[PDB]
């Protein structure tokens, strides 16, 4: 029941744009439930929003390994790669996000 509260704490801090503390409670959520792709995704979102694209790529990767149908994650890892000047993997991720968009 308990990463149902950590995730929500992280969510509540995310919703208010407090990424530093959002990360703190997203990481606690991931300690208890290391399988929830949604946790990997939102933690990926938090780093991305800070401009920590290196870590954003890292965490989106596993969110996409556990849920490859997450088109939003594909797209955001695509921006991350683009920011880093990785234009090949950016293209690669962008297309995969659009193939899930009718």
């Amino acid at each position: 029941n308990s990463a149902e509260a950590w995730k929500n704490l992280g969510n509540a801090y995310y919703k208010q744009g407090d990424y530093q503390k959002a990360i703190e409670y997203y990481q606690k959520a991931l300690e208890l439930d290391p399988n929830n792709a949604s946790a990997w995704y939102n933690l990926g979102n938090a780093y991305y929003k800070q401009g920590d694209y290196q870590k954003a790529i890292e965490y989106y990767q596993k969110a996409l390994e556990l849920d490859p149908n997450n088109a939003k994650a594909w797209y955001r890892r695509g921006n991350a790669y683009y920011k880093q000047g990785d234009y090949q993997k950016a293209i690669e991720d962008y297309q995969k996000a659009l193939e899930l968009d009718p």
């Binding site: 969510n11 995310y14 919703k15 939102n42 979102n45 991305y48 929003k49 939003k72 955001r76």
Partner: peptide, 5 residues
Amino acid sequence: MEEVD
């Protein structure tokens, strides 16, 4: 700006 699901 980006949303959340």
